[PDB]
Structure formats: structure tokens, C-alpha cells
Design a binder for these strands. Structure first.
Ligand SMILES: [Ca+2]
Ligand SMILES: [Ca+2]
Length: 294
DNA sequence: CACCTTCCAGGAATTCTTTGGCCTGCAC
DNA sequence: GGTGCAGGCCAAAGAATTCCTGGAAGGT
């Protein structure tokens, strides 16, 4: 179906997706190496439509339906990769994934000269794979004793469309219920984004760019990880909800968000204290997030 | 028959979600 | 014979995501 806005695309890619450089020796007597370039996303079936719309937008890559209960989009056809690179040069990433993507681009240029089939090709492309992702496997580590640091990237959030894309990937909207013996049962709206410590910068940018929220480190559970949380109702209703209302989310999360706002209006109309409306809230919370059923 | 690329399917590691509960300090 | 609540904190678990790999089907 439909295609996606470019910045929504880049944002969602910062959240999910991987750029990978395969370097595998030849099963043939050829003492050489075959080098593959792959950009692939793997999601729960709920969001398969996204995988389509990405395809529909790039018109490259294949979409495989897995038995894992997930769906995967792969782009490895060499010339098709141009599309990808063309995109992320006109709409760059901002998370640490940018680093990996850049190495991707680098590798592509090395293979574009068709020199990868050359000894020089092998020498350079390994120097690249060592830097991106988990680096070299043990085999390539023994075959190529070499010297390979890595500084953190600190880019600024481009716009709100990027945020709607990214949040559609890694954001969360939670309705917290605490029900003293008063029996009342309190309601609270939380908007959470969980990131690895390496993306601390992004987190910081988040607060300033939204002008609200608070960062909770989470190290007594080793992930590492840390969270960006917004719960103050003034900020949720005056700062968060309008953002994602004018820059719509994508994927099932949108529906979640919508139900979220249902709760938010009820909490604004003060109808959350009456038990009937509180029942309405409970019903919504029960049928969203992990509770929704597709 | 051979190189090489593009694809699928599998899978282990781990990074997200998503989920709660506890605490505190104002207003009143 | 302070207390109710909103705005914060503390975290866990599994599963959705991150990466990688083996094997083989398409083009020359
Ligand atoms: Ca992710
Ligand atoms: Ca997600």
C-alpha cells in the first residue's frame, strides 16, 4: 500500500533496522572472499505493512514471511543499494546507527570499483567490517591481524517527522493504574523511550527538543540502557499529544497512541474519578499494547 | 562447469518494549 | 490527632529486535 514520508522513513530506521557487511570465504578452491552488502529489517507480523510501504517507497528489496512469527525486508542487490544510500544522504540518521551506515557507504564505494574481487579489496573491506556492528568473527580475526577506536556520534534531532518515525519504532505509551485502601485507583500517563547507553546524546537532545521529560538511568539491571520518560500531565497534553497528532505515527503503535489519547481526554475532563469513566479507561488499557490482539 | 551474486531460512545474543510497584513533597 | 495525589522513582521479564551464518538457487 501507501508510501512513507522521507523523514518518517529515516526516523523509523534509526529505531529499527541493521546495515550489515558479510565477508565470507569462498567454498570454492578459489582462495578468495565473497562480500555481500545487506540492509534488513525484521519485525513482528503486526507491522508487516510497514515493510511493504518501505518497499513501496523504495521499490527495491524483497519481503520474506518467516515462521518466526515475523517478517523481513532485505536489500542486497548491489545496484538497488544506491537507492538506500541516496536516501540517507538526503535524509541522514542521527543515532549511533549513523556510524554503521557511514561504514556501509564506505564499503559500497570500495565494491563499486569492482576491486573487492582484488587483494586490495579484501584488505580494505575487512578494515571496514572490523569497525561496524560486532566486528570481525574469529576466522577473519586470525586471517587478518590488523589494528582497529570508535567515538560516539552526537547529531541534533532534525524535525518532528523524524521523531514520529523513530517513536513509531521504539517509543511506548503506557497507562499506569494504581488502585491506599480508599479504593479510588489512580491513573497516570507515561511516554517512554528505551535506548542503549551509547545513544545517551540522543536522549539528552530529546528533553531539550521536547522541552519536558526526565531521564532515568537503568544500571541496576545491566542492559546497559536508560529511559526517557514524560508523565507530567501538563507536558503530555500540551507538548506530547499535539506533536504526535500533527505528525502521525505509523504501524500498530498509532492505534495504541490513539487509545492513549482517549485516556488522556478522560483525564482532562476530570471524568477519571467517576467509576464509570474509570471503567471505560480500564477497558481501553486492557486492549492495547501487549493486550491488543491481531 | 565454473565464478559470483541474490535469496531464503535458521538461530543465538540482547536490546527493547511493556509492565508494574514504591516514594515524596506540595495543596489543602 | 496530616492525607490525598501528581509527579517522580525504583526496577523485571520475555520477546521483539540485532546481528550473523549456512546452504542454494539465478545469471553470466
Ligand atoms: Ca531497535
Ligand atoms: Ca518496535
Amino acid at each position: 500500500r501507501e508510501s512513507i514520508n522521507p523523514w518518517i522513513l529515516t526516523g523509523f530506521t534509526d529505531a529499527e533496522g541493521s546495515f550489515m557487511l558479510r565477508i565470507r570465504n569462498t567454498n570454492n578452491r578459489s582462495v578468495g572472499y565473497y562480500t555481500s552488502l545487506v540492509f534488513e529489517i525484521t519485525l513482528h507480523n503486526k507491522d508487516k505493512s510497514i515493510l511493504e510501504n518501505i518497499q513501496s517507497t523504495w521499490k527495491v528489496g524483497t519481503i520474506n514471511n518467516r515462521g518466526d512469527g515475523t517478517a523481513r525486508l532485505s536489500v542486497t542487490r548491489f545496484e538497488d543499494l544506491k537507492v538506500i544510500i541516496d536516501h540517507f544522504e538526503k535524509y541522514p540518521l542521527i543515532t549511533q546507527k549513523l556510524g554503521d551506515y557511514k561504514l556501509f557507504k564506505q564499503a559500497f564505494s570500495v565494491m563499486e570499483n569492482k576491486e573487492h574481487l582484488k587483494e586490495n579489496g579484501i584488505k580494505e573491506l575487512v578494515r571496514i567490517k572490523a569497525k561496524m556492528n560486532w566486528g570481525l568473527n574469529d576466522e577473519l580475526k586470525k586471517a587478518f591481524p590488523e589494528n582497529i577506536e570508535r567515538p560516539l556520534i552526537n547529531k541534533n534531532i532534525p524535525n518532528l517527522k523524524w521523531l514520529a518515525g523513530f517513536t513509531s519504532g521504539e517509543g511506548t505509551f503506557y497507562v499506569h493504574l494504581a488502585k491506599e485502601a480508599s479504593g479510588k485507583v489512580y491513573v497516570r500517563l507515561r511516554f517512554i523511550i528505551g535506548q542503549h547507553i551509547r545513544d545517551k546524546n540522543l536522549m539528552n537532545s530529546l528533553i531539550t527538543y521536547l522541552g519536558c521529560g526526565t531521564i532515568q538511568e537503568k544500571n541496576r539491571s545491566k542492559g546497559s540502557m536508560l529511559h526517557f520518560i514524560v508523565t507530567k500531565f501538563s507536558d503530555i497534553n500540551d507538548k506530547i499529544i499535539p506533536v504526535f497528532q500533527e505528525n502521525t505515527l505509523i504501524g500498530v503503535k498509532l492505534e495504541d497512541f490513539e487509545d492513549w489519547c482517549k485516556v488522556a481526554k478522560l483525564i482532562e475532563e476530570k471524568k477519571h474519578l467517576t467509576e464509570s469513566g474509570l471503567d471505560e479507561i480500564k477497558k481501553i488499557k486492557l486492549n492495547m499494547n501487549k493486550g491488543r490482539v491481531f
